[PDB]
Design a protein around this ligand. Structure first.
Ligand SMILES: *[C@@H]1O[C@H](CO)[C@@H](O[C@@H]2O[C@H](CO)[C@@H](O)[C@H](O)[C@H]2NC(C)=O)[C@H](O)[C@H]1NC(C)=O
Ligand SMILES: *[C@@H]1O[C@H](CO)[C@@H](O[C@@H]2O[C@H](CO)[C@@H](O)[C@H](O)[C@H]2NC(C)=O)[C@H](O)[C@H]1NC(C)=O
Ligand SMILES: *[C@@H]1O[C@H](CO)[C@@H](O[C@@H]2O[C@H](CO)[C@@H](O)[C@H](O)[C@H]2NC(C)=O)[C@H](O)[C@H]1NC(C)=O
Ligand SMILES: *[C@@H]1O[C@H](CO)[C@@H](O[C@@H]2O[C@H](CO)[C@@H](O)[C@H](O)[C@H]2NC(C)=O)[C@H](O)[C@H]1NC(C)=O
Ligand SMILES: *[C@@H]1O[C@H](CO)[C@@H](O[C@@H]2O[C@H](CO)[C@@H](O)[C@H](O)[C@H]2NC(C)=O)[C@H](O)[C@H]1NC(C)=O
Ligand SMILES: *[C@@H]1O[C@H](CO)[C@@H](O[C@@H]2O[C@H](CO)[C@@H](O)[C@H](O)[C@H]2NC(C)=O)[C@H](O)[C@H]1NC(C)=O
Ligand SMILES: *[C@@H]1O[C@H](CO)[C@@H](O[C@@H]2O[C@H](CO)[C@@H](O)[C@H](O)[C@H]2NC(C)=O)[C@H](O)[C@H]1NC(C)=O
Ligand SMILES: *[C@@H]1O[C@H](CO)[C@@H](O)[C@H](O)[C@H]1NC(C)=O
Lengths: 133, 49, 172, 197, 49, 36
């Protein structure tokens, strides 16, 4: 039993490791069987501070890391009458009296598509010429 | 079964007890005619703004 | 529906709005948790201040955790917590993944790392540097030569202490 | 080798596809009418209440479409924020070396390279990370002839017997000379001075 | 009772959808604020600005 | 399709690759000086 609720099928452990499948209230579970334990923030160390001691590195490394960013999605357009009435006359006549929802419905999607193209264009077209190696 | 579209020859296989297949979202995609018992294919003609 | 079968049957034929609603709410909750995770868990290890503290005359006693309180929260954090004041028919509140204690632990780790090491611990491994020898660099980064800091160390420490007391008075 | 690395883009694609698919699936809901197929309800009644049933269908489908448009708008706002961030990173890390800490890459920044992706961009950030530390003894000033000498650029260290000035990110000692240190008055007030030559 | 139940269902559903939409807007606002907070954490605590 | 259409993006993937290659050759041969 924990603050999050009642846990059945897992056995408690007094140790503490990283968190695999977060459960809540600071505890989570993992696989050895299945065990539930308390989340551990990481390896605790005490930096050897003084008032006349410094540490200067002697060597270095160069690292390369990836970073992923979405910039766009698919542009979608919709047609009212085909969607709602399915090519019927009486349905179209009934829909006619609901005012003009369809105008702004299509307007919003058009704005979305224009914004998508603008997004890609402003992200990538940062240069004026086309250089070659 | 009522629907609008263009009908073509289809190579898909029905088991001898089905009558008309579909693909996903419950959209008919292949129909077997009640008379000659041949499997066809359905595609609506194009529409565009 | 409030636990009624006919209401449930009637609602069943309205499609799948409820799946969308639950999906949106769950997405919001997961966003909350990942939000706290990214704002706070900026360090790889947990650092600790040395038992003896001589930071060139500066005084962080009002900011470092106090072992007397079980939560090990600093005095200003206690003032902030005591300042603000805040399951019937389907509504439910889920607890956050990180309790307040580990939030305080990350805060203390960040703060003890930046007192001792400086900016280095965010870009590799923490390195020792005396605090009076660190503010000098922070002057050298704003166009003031470090010559100033050493010749006005005590006055600067006094100003810092007075400001850190006045902030407490105003907040309280 | 490792899969499940392009998580965000795959999630975006799945979100859009799922939204479209559920919007299509909404077409088979009674919404309180006798049937979800329009032709049968037209062919099985008379206009008096057939118009009522069609009104039910119209209301339901209009609500569904409105909700779908609203979700599209929210997602578009989020993607626009992400794209603005991406453009800023492109113009600040690719076309120049950045100074703000932990904006692009963990550590001191050197460069970045862009690569395309089906609906986004992938940056390769090249960063410099020090390692193999050591221990030394410092002092903020050097008292010579009663004057104080402070380093022009670097820090004082000593391996136990002799003192050197180094740069602050790579161990490289140099003998102290009057052309890499500057004077400021006499040393009787600084806390941590050490005698030397 | 069917029509009355339908009216109640429609009203409550509308209210619930409105609540969810407001929650989404507020969540977007909070996420923007938290992104700013994380940026300030990284740029100003872990180094000078 | 049920009245719902997807529109092609203005910039095909090829010219996106062309932009990326131009940017990358520029940042190799010139450095940052081509950004001004
Ligand atoms: C700095 O680190 C590099 C590796 O990151 C060291 O290079 C290695 O040196 C050893 C012995 O000289 C060789 O056996 C390895 O093959 C080298 N590795 C590589 C990748 O070249 C380098 O010696 C270190 N230098 C200092 C001063 O610590
Ligand atoms: C309906 O009757 C027609 C007329 O016989 C059937 O058509 C025959 O089908 C068989 C096998 O498919 C062919 O060998 C004959 O040549 C066809 N006859 C003609 C005149 O085309 C048809 O199969 C029947 N449909 C059923 C039983 O479903
Ligand atoms: C650092 O600041 C704290 C602020 O509380 C100082 O603690 C106070 O010290 C004075 C004098 O000893 C006492 O009269 C107060 O009662 C203390 N306050 C508390 C809350 O304990 C502390 O002395 C300062 N340390 C140094 C080295 O100056
Ligand atoms: C610099 O010196 C300090 C003081 O000796 C080192 O800190 C201790 O190092 C020993 C190594 O034998 C450890 O057993 C102790 O646990 C360390 N003290 C603490 C409080 O952790 C420090 O490691 C040295 N730094 C380097 C880079 O060698
Ligand atoms: C500290 O460094 C200095 C300078 O490198 C050392 O002084 C010389 O060290 C070399 C060997 O590296 C000896 O051959 C010389 O005899 C030393 N003296 C002079 C005047 O050159 C010093 O030995 C080092 N000491 C320690 C404890 O590391
Ligand atoms: C650094 O800390 C040490 C230890 O606290 C200080 O050493 C003290 O120096 C005074 C005289 O300056 C002596 O009276 C004490 O007995 C020393 N303490 C110990 C434990 O030896 C040293 O002064 C400090 N230096 C700086 C620049 O802060
Ligand atoms: C560093 O050198 C100065 C200059 O000699 C020392 O200051 C002298 O100390 C002696 C004895 O401690 C006194 O008799 C003199 O009056 C002091 N002044 C002068 C001008 O000689 C100082 O003690 C040395 N050590 C340190 C740590 O500063
Ligand atoms: C954890 O420790 C408590 C007391 O220290 C003990 O009663 C309990 O049995 C322990 N549990 C495990 C799984 O070791």
């Amino acid at each position: 039993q924990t603050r999050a609720g009642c846990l059945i099928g897992a056995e408690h452990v007094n140790n503490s490791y990283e968190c695999d499948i977060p459960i809540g209230a600071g505890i989570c579970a993992s696989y050895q069987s299945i065990i539930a334990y308390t989340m551990s923030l990481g390896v605790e160390n005490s930096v050897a501070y003084s008032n006349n001691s410094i540490a200067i590195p002697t060597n270095f490394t160069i690292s390369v890391t990836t970073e992923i960013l979405p910039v766009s999605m698919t542009k979608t357009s919709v047609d009212c009458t085909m969607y709602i009435c399915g090519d019927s006359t009486e349905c179209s006549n009934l829909l006619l009296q609901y005012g003009s929802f369809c105008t702004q419905l299509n307007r919003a999607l058009t704005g979305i598509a224009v914004e998508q193209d603008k997004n890609t264009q402003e992200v990538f077209a940062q240069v004026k010429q086309i250089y070659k190696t | 079964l009522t629907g609008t579209g263009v009908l073509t020859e289809s190579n898909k296989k029905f088991l001898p007890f089905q009558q008309f297949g579909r693909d996903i979202a419950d959209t008919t995609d292949a129909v077997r005619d009640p008379q000659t018992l041949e499997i066809l294919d359905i595609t609506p003609c194009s529409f565009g703004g | 529906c409030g636990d009624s079968t006919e209401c449930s049957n009637l609602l069943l034929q309205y499609g799948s709005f409820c799946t969308q609603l639950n999906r949106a709410l769950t997405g919001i909750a997961v966003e909350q948790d990942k939000n706290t995770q990214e704002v706070f868990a900026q360090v790889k290890q947990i650092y600790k201040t040395p038992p003896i503290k001589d930071f060139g005359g500066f005084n962080f006693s009002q900011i470092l955790p106090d072992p007397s309180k079980p939560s090990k929260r600093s005095f200003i954090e206690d003032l902030l917590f005591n300042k603000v004041t805040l399951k019937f028919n389907g509504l439910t509140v889920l607890p956050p993944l990180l309790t307040d204690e580990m939030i305080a632990q990350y805060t203390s780790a960040l703060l003890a790392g930046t007192i001792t090491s400086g900016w280095t611990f965010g870009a590799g491994a923490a390195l020792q540097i005396p605090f009076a020898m660190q503010m000098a660099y922070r002057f050298n980064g704003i166009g003031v030569t470090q010559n100033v800091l050493y010749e006005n160390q005590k006055l600067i420490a006094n100003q810092f202490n007075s400001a850190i007391g006045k902030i407490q008075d105003s907040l309280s | 080798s490792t899969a499940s690395a392009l998580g965000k883009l795959q999630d975006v694609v799945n979100q859009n596809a799922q939204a479209l698919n559920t919007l299509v699936k909404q077409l088979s809901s009674n919404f309180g009418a006798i049937s979800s197929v329009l032709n049968d309800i037209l062919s099985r009644l008379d206009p008096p209440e057939a118009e009522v049933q069609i009104d039910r269908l119209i209301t339901g489908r209009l609500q569904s479409l409105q909700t779908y448009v609203t979700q599209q708008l929210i997602r578009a706002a989020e993607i626009r924020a992400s794209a603005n961030l991406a453009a800023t990173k492109m113009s600040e890390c690719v076309l120049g070396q950045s100074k703000r800490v932990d904006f692009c890459g963990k550590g001191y920044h050197l460069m970045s390279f862009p690569q395309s992706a089906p609906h986004g961009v992938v940056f390769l950030h090249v960063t410099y990370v020090p390692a193999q530390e050591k221990n030394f003894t410092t002092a903020p000033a050097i008292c010579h002839d009663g004057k104080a000498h402070f380093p022009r650029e670097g820090v004082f260290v000593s391996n136990g017997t002799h003192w050197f000035v180094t740069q602050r990110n790579f161990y490289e000692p140099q003998i102290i000379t009057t052309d890499n240190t500057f004077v400021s008055g006499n040393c009787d007030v600084v806390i941590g001075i050490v005698n030397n030559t």
